[PDB]
Design a protein around this ligand. Structure first.
Ligand SMILES: CCC(F)(F)C(=O)C[S@@](=O)c1ccc(C(=O)N2CCN(c3cccc(Cl)c3)[C@@H](C)[C@@H]2C)cc1Cl
Length: 289
């Protein structure tokens, strides 16, 4: 019997099998009545779908059917940890799950919600099907890297290195950059489904590929979106949020900056987190009324 990396049989859990024959763990939050819309939640690098419990329960409370899976190599899904043959695998698998849910709920609008690497996934998904999605909620999406982190010289060394030792690790993540909320950093550091190990250079190359692909996608992007960004984000540089606002073709685009906030805005200081929830609630409510 096929089992999650934590040894739980997939037959006990919601799942799907992707185009490469890998089992992905799925999560669903369905209202009691006919939903008004569908929304897919796209998690970030090293995390998993269970970190969106509270946001998902809020969206289900608006009578959306919320659904997610753990990306390949993440959470309770199969695959070598935090490795992907090419970044587009994540997009492909999102589209499989979206197409499965649309078949079951024909005619309902479908939204995307993406954070971090999952925001880059959401952008690329929406740019692959222009006109298809009703809207996107992006929380600190990967659009631009921290310019210090990703100099021409560090990127050219990292391509040379990846041609020899694609499995070489960077250091562990500084989880202290994720949030000013120390209890949320402690929760992240003790979550057995998070990968906080070094990133492999081959996966760092796939994140640079995502950044490249997002830039080429922005002039195709027409989908309505809400963009939430902290000013003190050391992973997804705030300059990327400005770039997405400038280059997207979307007629309906809104940015809110959280002054002083770190990366995980939905698990930040309580004033930030409460604002993030409220803004998502109003933006989705307006567009499902
Ligand atoms: C919890 C959710 C989440 F994890 F926060 C996200 O999904 C964040 S994910 O979008 C992400 C974004 C940026 C970085 C990061 O600091 N860098 C800078 C250095 N980069 C780089 C530099 C030289 C060479 C190479 Cl090969 C790569 C990449 C590793 C990447 C662009 C790291 C990550 Cl993990």
């Amino acid at each position: 019997p096929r089992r999650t990396p934590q040894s739980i049989p997939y037959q006990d859990l919601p799942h799907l099998v992707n185009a490469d024959g890998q089992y992905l763990f799925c999560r669903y939050w369905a209202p009691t009545g006919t939903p008004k819309a569908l929304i897919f939640v796209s998690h970030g690098a090293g995390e998993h779908s269970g970190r969106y419990e509270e946001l998902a329960r809020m969206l289900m409370g608006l009578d959306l059917l919320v659904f997610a899976h753990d990306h390949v190599g993440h959470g309770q899904s199969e695959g070598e940890r935090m490795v992907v043959s090419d970044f587009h695998v994540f997009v492909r698998d999102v589209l499989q799950h979206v197409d499965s849910m649309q078949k079951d709920y024909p005619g309902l609008p479908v939204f995307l919600l993406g954070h971090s690497m999952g925001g880059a996934i959401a952008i690329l998904t929406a740019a692959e099907r222009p006109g298809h999605f009703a809207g996107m909620v992006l929380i600190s999406p990967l659009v631009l890297a921290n310019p210090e982190s990703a100099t021409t010289f560090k990127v050219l060394a990292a391509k040379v290195l990846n041609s020899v030792l694609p499995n070489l690790s960077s250091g562990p993540i500084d989880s202290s950059v994720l949030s000013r909320n120390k209890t949320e950093v402690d929760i992240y550091n003790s979550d057995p489904l998070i990968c906080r190990a070094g990133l492999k250079v081959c996966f760092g190359i796939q994140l640079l590929n995502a950044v490249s692909r997002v830039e080429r996608a922005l002039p195709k992007l027409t989908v309505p979106f809400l963009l939430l960004q902290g000013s003190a984000d050391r992973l997804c540089d705030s300059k990327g949020a400005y770039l997405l606002m400038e280059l997207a073709k979307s007629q309906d685009k809104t940015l809110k900056i959280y002054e002083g906030a770190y990366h995980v805005l939905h698990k930040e200081l309580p004033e930030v987190t409460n604002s993030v929830f409220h803004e998502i609630n109003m933006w989705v409510s307006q567009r499902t009324a």
